[PDB]
Design an enzyme around this catalytic site. Structure first.
Site, short mmCIF file in Angstrom:
data_model
loop_
_atom_site.label_atom_id
_atom_site.label_comp_id
_atom_site.label_asym_id
_atom_site.label_seq_id
_atom_site.Cartn_x
_atom_site.Cartn_y
_atom_site.Cartn_z
N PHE A 90 0.87 -1.21 0.00
CA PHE A 90 0.00 0.00 0.00
C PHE A 90 0.90 1.25 0.00
N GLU B 130 -8.57 -1.97 10.81
CA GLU B 130 -7.73 -3.08 11.33
C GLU B 130 -6.39 -2.52 11.82
OE1 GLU B 130 -8.08 -6.35 8.50
OE2 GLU B 130 -10.21 -6.33 8.86
N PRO C 194 -10.97 -11.81 17.05
CA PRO C 194 -10.31 -12.14 18.31
C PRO C 194 -9.05 -13.00 18.26
CG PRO C 194 -12.66 -12.30 18.60
CD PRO C 194 -12.42 -12.04 17.14
N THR D 155 -5.26 -8.83 19.51
CA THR D 155 -6.45 -8.05 19.07
C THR D 155 -7.36 -7.77 20.26
OG1 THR D 155 -6.41 -8.33 16.76
CG2 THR D 155 -8.62 -8.40 17.83
N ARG E 153 -7.30 -17.74 -0.50
CA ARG E 153 -6.27 -18.45 -1.28
C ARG E 153 -6.45 -19.96 -1.09
N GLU F 266 -16.90 -5.03 8.90
CA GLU F 266 -16.45 -5.61 7.61
C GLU F 266 -16.43 -7.11 7.84
OE1 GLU F 266 -12.44 -4.74 6.77
OE2 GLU F 266 -12.30 -6.05 4.99
N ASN G 265 -14.34 -11.39 -5.03
CA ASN G 265 -15.27 -12.51 -5.31
C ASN G 265 -16.45 -12.51 -4.31
OD1 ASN G 265 -13.45 -14.49 -7.23
ND2 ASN G 265 -12.16 -13.48 -5.71
C1 LIG Z 1 -10.87 -6.13 5.15
C2 LIG Z 1 -10.18 -4.96 4.45
O1 LIG Z 1 -10.51 -3.70 5.04
C3 LIG Z 1 -10.53 -4.97 2.97
O2 LIG Z 1 -10.06 -3.74 2.38
C4 LIG Z 1 -9.95 -6.25 2.35
O3 LIG Z 1 -10.37 -6.33 0.99
C5 LIG Z 1 -9.34 -6.14 0.02
C6 LIG Z 1 -9.91 -6.20 -1.39
N1 LIG Z 1 -11.31 -5.81 -1.51
C7 LIG Z 1 -11.94 -5.52 -2.67
C8 LIG Z 1 -11.05 -5.38 -3.87
O4 LIG Z 1 -13.16 -5.37 -2.75
C9 LIG Z 1 -10.53 -7.50 3.03
C10 LIG Z 1 -10.00 -8.81 2.43
O5 LIG Z 1 -8.91 -9.22 2.77
O6 LIG Z 1 -10.69 -9.40 1.66
C11 LIG Z 1 -10.43 -7.46 4.57
O7 LIG Z 1 -9.09 -7.69 5.00
#
Ligand SMILES: *[C@@H]1[C@H](O)[C@@H](O)[C@H](OCCNC(C)=O)[C@@H](C(=O)O)[C@H]1O
Ligand SMILES: *[C@@H]1O[C@H](CO)[C@@H](O)[C@H](O)[C@H]1NC(C)=O
Ligand SMILES: *[C@@H]1O[C@H](CO)[C@@H](O)[C@H](O)[C@H]1NC(C)=O
Ligand SMILES: *[C@@H]1O[C@H](CO)[C@@H](O)[C@H](O)[C@H]1NC(C)=O
Lengths: 73, 384
Positions: free
Chosen positions: B1, B66, B112, B116, B144, B184, B231
């Protein structure tokens, strides 16, 4: 045999969830996409979104902590 | 990032989108803008609030995503103590902003782990008082390595219960009564599992998550994502709704805010999963007192559910979701009561048509399916 008896608690509410219980995110990542403007422009997409109303929409994700507001742009 | 920027433009498209779609925007501010002392630098946030105010924008806020992996993510560590102080600064700013009476949620911690736990306890001790809800993140699986078996495994579904319990342990110890949100969540992190996060098979996890969230006292569940690259998107790259979208629409129409309880008699109750709310009463077919049962069958055979006394002779509307072949559970298409669910057009959603069952029939639920059942004229005083 494949018959199953259900027990129900009905005396009182155990919880009140929000009317917005089922809510949704847009990843902050999506604002690094060139098509971003086209995408949230989509009237089809807006139709689909309206159907989940009421809901919170969280704009956030990993990129939340790598995005900087520019008033000049 | 790396650092990217975004314009007054970006904000506007986002706002009108939520505005126009009848949705409540929560915006997450960058918490890695640090001062030398590694206090949060709030100058950039000031510009954005100023702009948003200037436009009369009704917006709620968050600060960070996070924070637990800031060290792995940005090689910066920030403890919950500091992050709590940071939430107080931002809260003061919102009080001095034109949206003095806007909501502030946080801290969007991952699920958790021991570390965390510590971050969240110390954050809540610190900043607990200024946040309107506690936001935390859940994923069942690594995108994955997730398999089709995982998505069907009651042992995977059941782990989420412990997750919630650990979270409620930290909150009750620091800010008892504070609302808890999932900020999320989806099937699988790393963007989801190709051919799984986007299929009918995704719906076992999604509906059970909703069932358990509501039962265990989660007030709001935020689905990663409505649309995007991942996905786990509810809508795909062609603006077509996937089975989780249809599932989310149906839940929204049938399921009330008042949470009840159902359970199955017998030592085994892991593969047949059952939830009970008051019926969503907005729905003009349904009256005060009606019940919505929803049920997930992870058996490889049909199961027949008998309603307990005195509901065994009520009229029941079935809403059974099964995949459109040929890809079964790996299908991106879904039928309600054997009708395929498609947009009528870009502007128009279909009716969601019930199937009245004969009063007194058991509730048939095929192998690897999920259904809602509205119990009509249940006359439940809790739901009145
Ligand atoms: C929570 C994160 O805040 C998400 O940004 C992350 O998604 C990454 C890709 N999301 C898209 C392209 O829609 C998510 C994840 O790993 O899937 C969580 O870690
Ligand atoms: C925070 O940001 C401002 C603007 O860039 C900067 O000049 C200032 O030095 C920073 N503040 C601290 C205390 O580090
Ligand atoms: C937490 O961080 C602050 C600085 O924000 C530091 O001064 C404090 O002592 C830290 N405590 C622990 C145990 O990490
Ligand atoms: C269901 O699963 C069992 C596993 O014990 C399997 O052996 C059985 O034949 C399956 N039944 C079907 C597909 O009807």
């Amino acid at each position: 045999q494949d018959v199953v008896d259900l027990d129900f608690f009905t005396q009182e509410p155990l919880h009140l969830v929000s009317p917005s219980f089922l809510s949704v995110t847009i990843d902050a990542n999506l604002a690094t996409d060139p098509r971003f403007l086209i995408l949230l422009g989509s009237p089809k997409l807006r139709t689909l979104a309206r159907g989940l109303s009421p809901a919170y929409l969280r704009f956030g994700g990993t990129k939340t902590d790598f995005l900087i507001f520019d008033p000049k742009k | 990032f790396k650092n990217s920027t975004y314009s007054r433009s970006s904000v506007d498209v986002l706002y009108t989108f939520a505005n126009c779609s009848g949705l409540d925007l929560i915006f997450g501010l960058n918490a890695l803008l640090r001062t030398a002392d590694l206090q949060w630098n709030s100058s950039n946030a000031q510009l954005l609030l100023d702009y948003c105010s200037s436009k009369g924008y009704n917006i709620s806020w968050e600060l960070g995503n996070e924070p637990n992996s800031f060290l792995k993510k940005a090689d910066i560590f920030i403890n919950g103590s500091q992050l709590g102080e940071d939430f107080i600064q931002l809260h003061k700013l919102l009080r001095k902003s034109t949206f003095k009476n806007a909501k502030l949620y946080g801290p969007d911690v991952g699920q958790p782990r021991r570390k965390t736990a510590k971050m969240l306890k110390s954050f809540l001790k610190a900043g607990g008082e200024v946040i309107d809800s506690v936001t935390w993140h859940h994923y069942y699986l690594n995108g994955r390595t997730a398999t089709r078996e995982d998505f069907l495994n009651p042992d995977v579904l059941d782990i989420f219960i412990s997750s919630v319990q650990k979270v409620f342990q930290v909150v009750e110890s620091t800010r008892p009564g504070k609302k808890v949100w999932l900020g999320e969540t989806s099937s699988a992190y790393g963007g989801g599992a190709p051919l799984l996060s986007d299929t009918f098979a995704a719906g076992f996890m999604w509906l059970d998550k909703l069932g358990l969230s509501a039962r265990m006292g989660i007030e709001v569940v935020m689905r990663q994502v409505f649309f995007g690259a991942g996905n786990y998107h509810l809508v795909d790259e062609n603006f077509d709704p996937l089975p989780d979208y249809w599932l989310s629409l149906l839940f929204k129409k049938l399921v009330g805010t008042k949470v009840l309880m159902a359970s199955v008699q017998g030592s085994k109750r892991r593969k047949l999963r059952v939830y009970l709310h008051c019926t969503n009463t907005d729905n003009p077919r349904y009256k005060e007192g009606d019940l919505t049962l929803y049920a997930i069958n992870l058996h490889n055979v049909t199961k027949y559910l008998r309603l307990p006394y005195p509901f065994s002779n009520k009229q029941v509307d079935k809403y059974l979701l099964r995949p459109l072949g040929p890809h079964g559970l790996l299908s991106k298409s879904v039928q309600l009561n054997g009708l395929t669910l498609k947009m009528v057009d870009d502007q128009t959603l279909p009716p969601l048509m019930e199937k009245p069952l004969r009063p007194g029939s058991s509730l048939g639920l095929p192998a690897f399916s999920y259904s809602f059942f509205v119990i009509r004229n249940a006359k439940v005083a809790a739901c009145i």
